[PDB]
Subunit: 366 residues, 5 copies
């Protein structure tokens, strides 16, 4: 994921114009091979029109430039690009909200599954490893960067998510489908065993763990749904036709003709159609937005860092439920225990922009 | 469902242009009969204009080509296509999220309904079969591919979802409406019987089962709502008129006239209007997107695989609540039990793209 | 509601073109009186131009046809129609999801309110009648078809939703507002009485009934909100002006002039502007979409069948909580009790389209 | 709020054309002063062109009419109006769903807080008054019509929402911010006191009251968020510039020139540009839609009736939790106690439109 | 945040035209440097065309003005601006709803965590400080104005959110990632300690605190997701190219040529292209809307007041859970204890606009 949020914090003079010189995840990284092909077919059509095309067919070619330019319907391309791309960014953002994060589950495990002994932390470490295993098994199904890290189940056993004796349980289940759900059933069999032994003391404390797991698996179940049910291929191919057929009538219809032939609106030869290549940055570059986000789990520069989130949500959960269980600082009085205004002080930099009176509503004329 | 997600993982040079040669669920599979009819009425109008139409009516026909081309309002067709199709893909995706999946219910049944004996697994197998029966009864109402698998209720009894003695209970309920809800009431009468016998030990454990069933039936209730309440026929017929009346003024208005007659912008004869057929791929093909997703439960190639999800969610639930109930591997220490960094190792392929420092926020200039 | 979902299951050759011959809920049922008025003012303007208009004002009329056609801004009408109609279909679908359905409440009443005696079924029948009464009282406020069935409260008492002695309780509450909430307060006073008597055994079982009622009343409360807060009249009148003022400049600007006068683009007389009436099907018919869904509770053919849902959700709830309470078939083994694959068999028709290998993810190259 | 829902129940011949004669909340009530200014600057520019402008500058003025008409970009105004207004109607409807309604809380108070004595109804009346006070304190902050009813806190004490001794508690909290939250903390301190005294019998009954209050305050917290965080002023000023700069190039570019001067497309003098004023109804009237809904809590005719909802949700809650607590009619048998079909009868008017067979699904060919 | 809601309460004559003279957060504050550069390159191109450009290249320059004006595709810029900006305002508003507010948690802490002694208020003050610390640690990661207030963790310790002995616990956790979650795990370890000691009396009272914390942290977790996963840089650069390449063909294509040269539509010299600068307010100003909301946590005038919400939600929570715990006014009878109509009185200003009869539904013809 290309993060440029700190560059665009405040709207400056050169706000978005400094963004046109970046390379990682940019438009020029995706379109430098297509503009070489577009100039490769434009210069092959102009150098043949000046040199190869003879005079009887130079008149016929000029009858085709005025035919292709009038059919260059550049308006209706913007709606089959406009409505298709916002369908894509809607699915691209909903695929990130469906990423399996164990952060809502690591606060319930550390709050409900109790015990300071070896078995007490073994329950909290295995419950979070079962959540971490079920996120590895679904991300290695939908993302190429995780599958290159875990090509086999033995690469998951060697990584520490699965043990050697859980793989005998995992591989002896006669199921012809994907088995990312398996660790989520091991979560329920272990949370019901810890509830029976008294590790989970209350009854609502056990219900919250099974509530917060169905929020976590549905996230694993949605990633399998977005991977299987993509956008319709008939709807991807319409947008691909509409851009490339516009760029077929514009490859010929924007050819620079001979001025002395005597044709309307064709009186110059720029030697390079610079306001046509800038249409190729805008029309074809709008398609390359949706080419990058149609599968955000690949290995593009602006794709989702799925291997970052696996190592993060495996380390910060084992830190939270094993090393941070019931290890608190002792309770002392706050800095504003006797002050009726718990107002934190300011620095010198954020000091004179903070003199506005408090907004209390639109009707109170302050 | 046509899945092409692995082809479009990273944006390449020939990224979406390789998609224009696929056949299953494509645009050419849906439009090869219409372009034959469109060329069948274009070539019947051109071969009559050169040969059948005499000179007094060849002048009158040329007065009609310039009349139909100026009314070829290709711009306003893109908005009655643009706003109607995104209404359709919104309903097409919401009909997939309303698909009855028993995965959120198979984790509560294996966690709350207990017992290792024959009656203990008979409760878990009948509770999941009642969820699986209520998904069969609603999918055979809304989807053609399931109704060809279950034309009668006896085809559901022979398949194993309903027993022979439950059909006497199912068919003696004097109700003139659809009875997909029936197994969801059998779920509540069986979950309250297992709670009374002590199979469901806690009180919040019984409340979670009735909570997770109302999430499951509302999914069965939404599929009946999308099947009954389709998009308005007055709104389908406006889009169908607007495309086919544009293609009536474009069938005549884009005719290739005689150049020597002396008319503006009509100086050539391509013998095949290739930039008009490419408008037929884009305008009529945009309508065939919404023709395929207006009922996604049919038997198209890009329709929902409803019979896959019936056999999957009947097999993986009976595997989870009967064979996987309280059958865990024994608890042992993890690979990172003494390591303060639970960091899984990497392979050689995903090795040198993983050297970025960890993103901690936009304000920390790293 | 006009349901045509079975006709549009698979995209055929004549897929949407068979829809243009339907009559119920169609475009021709709504626009046959307006095209008679539109031709009534077009033919009154043409037959006066040939016969009534003399030569000094036939030149002045021709100066007005070329003035009205250049102001025929057919493009900006499509956006005040495009954005207004999708606001309308968004409210039209959200008014159907806010329809009071007692199906999520009939599963909690049959699962929590217990008792096989006369008082045990009287509690379940009165709790569901109080939900059914509160849906009648809100639908007779917002829908014309229910108010013609229940013009007075005595028509609700005679129908069986309210008793004769509940109407004395209903009509002696000194409230000047709508009283659809009243039965939802009778639900809470009866669910707390059954909980106190031991009919509702558990404490979470009583909390689920008050949870599922606030989901049900908010649905009754949303129908009162959509009925009171419609779309803004200033926003309805802008779209009505923009279509009818476009059809004023197009009623005169698309008049067929005399060819020998010598004017550009006016060289024919079709005797009937067929590509202008087809613009009246598309522009005015787009407005008649939003004319039908601005109040979907009327008595149009494509309006909501509110009287169907009253009789359905009153019959299937009394069937579920009175005749179906704790009346189950006895537990027996399933058809796949010893088989590790619970795979239901197929027919002969859905037999050879089911040979695809199971999709397990995009990265597994199968 | 202007409610016209009963007029638009069924799509008639004069369906939306009867709406163009209404006055309350209409387009003519908002635009009668602007069309007087628009004609005031059009007639001041035409009567100066015929009379004041001499012949050497009548030629220069005619060079400016053809310059302003070609820059009259009426297309791109419809998208900065189209996307801005649907952002506004999205916020205008979400501000109505965030209106603090005590109806979901009056059913939990009457169901959980018990007692028939004086203290038993004093708990239910004070808990609902604390919800009603917290809605008054947020609506008098965000709405002008409530602030004109409660300019001071003593106008709230005299109205009965706050007592004289609660104002000493309210005004001695040293907080410089808005204090609409205060009564919601008084709700929790009173619900925990009634739970301790045994007025709230169960433990889940107390959890539902604190659950349903956080749904109620977040509604009060969202109204403070929409009042403080409006739409961006840079995004309001772009739409205001784009309409008023289009109406500057159209004020001059649509001037009726002298026909004998010899200019293209300018051959008449209508003496009043009627298809330009109809563009002022459509373009400027689209802006006046968003001028009315940018703050829906003012005192327009189509604004939210906030003082209606204060008096309604203060009267129907005190009626529900004080006069309607545990005052039920006695349980008797329904009208369909022995009938297996609980089908309510029909009238004579809704009698022959009810003969359709019941829809059971798309696949059942009925 | 620039709040102007009180100015736009009612739609007046000069409603939005008074907004075009504001300066804070306006369009002129963001675009006064770009119109100086745009006039700086327009006047450098006109003063070179009159004076520097000689007659042989004054003819070649005039061949380029008519070439750049025909490629000035001002229509397709409005859709790559229209669909990109509403993606931005969707993320800008969802980043405000994901702001960590402790108001839903301060009502559960004051209602469940009990005790009037020193340890009883120390539990409520430390639980709310742990929520307030976790909002400081995520806002100093994503917002520049908070990071200038807390550049180090010692600036948070000196401010009072963290103690000196909690920083030893905070900095000895060997984690290479962001540690905003840490105080949310300290919340669970303290809420489970207070539940064990009997400070939290009930079991559902403890479950509500862990429920309302996962609502609060997911808000802290969403701010880290919006900061890391911005909009795609390929999609920001397409919109930046499309505006700046339109303003390259419009910088040259809208040049005022010499009238006597003899070119179509170029007959005047305004000496300042006022309807082109007004296109720069509309096209480039539409981009500066999305330049300000792409990171709403900076230090613009219309950015989010993040330091206001830190001091507010730290003061009003310590006021609610420490000074306002179980300190109620005594219960007395309301003003409408014997009146069956709890109708609050009106003033004189809001007196004669309140005579409408109560809306009870669309079907009741009142
Ligand atoms: Ca990708
Ligand atoms: Ca289909
Ligand atoms: Ca209707
Ligand atoms: Ca207003
Ligand atoms: Ca900013
Ligand atoms: Cl609960």
């Amino acid at each position: 994921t290309v993060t440029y949020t700190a560059r665009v914090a405040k709207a400056r003079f050169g706000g978005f114009s400094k963004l046109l010189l970046l390379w990682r995840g940019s438009i020029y990284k995706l379109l430098w091979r297509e503009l070489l092909c577009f100039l490769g077919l434009f210069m092959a059509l102009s150098a043949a029109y000046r040199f190869v095309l003879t005079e009887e067919q130079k008149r016929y070619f000029e009858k085709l430039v005025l035919y292709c330019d009038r059919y260059a319907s550049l308006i209706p391309v913007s709606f089959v690009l406009g409505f298709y791309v916002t369908l894509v960014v809607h699915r691209w953002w909903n695929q990130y909200l469906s990423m399996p994060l164990t952060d809502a589950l690591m606060c319930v495990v550390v709050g409900t599954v109790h015990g300071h002994d070896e078995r007490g932390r073994l329950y909290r470490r295995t419950l979070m490893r079962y959540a971490g295993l079920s996120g590895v098994l679904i991300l290695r199904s939908v993302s190429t960067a995780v599958f290159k890290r875990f090509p086999t189940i033995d690469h998951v056993v060697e990584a520490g998510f699965m043990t050697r004796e859980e793989r005998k349980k995992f591989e002896n289940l006669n199921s012809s489908y994907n088995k990312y759900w398996v660790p989520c059933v091991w979560f329920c069999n272990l949370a019901a065993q810890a509830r029976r032994e008294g590790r989970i003391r209350d009854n609502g404390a056990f219900k919250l763990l099974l509530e917060e797991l169905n929020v976590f698996r549905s996230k694993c179940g949605m990633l399998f749904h977005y991977d299987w049910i993509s956008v319709p291929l008939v709807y991807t191919q319409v947008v691909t036709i509409a851009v490339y057929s516009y760029f077929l009538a514009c490859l010929i219809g924007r050819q620079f003709l001979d001025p002395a032939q005597g044709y309307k609106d064709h009186d110059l030869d720029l030697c390079v159609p610079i306001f046509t290549l800038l249409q190729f940055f805008f029309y074809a570059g709008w398609l390359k937005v949706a080419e990058q986000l149609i599968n955000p789990f690949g290995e593009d520069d602006d794709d989702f860092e799925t291997n970052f989130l696996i190592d993060r949500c495996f380390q910060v959960s084992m830190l939270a439920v094993d090393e941070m269980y019931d290890d608190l600082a002792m309770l002392e009085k706050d800095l504003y225990w006797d002050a009726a205004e718990a107002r934190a002080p300011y620095t010198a930099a954020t000091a004179f922009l903070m003199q506005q009176p408090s907004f209390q509503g639109s009707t109170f004329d302050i």
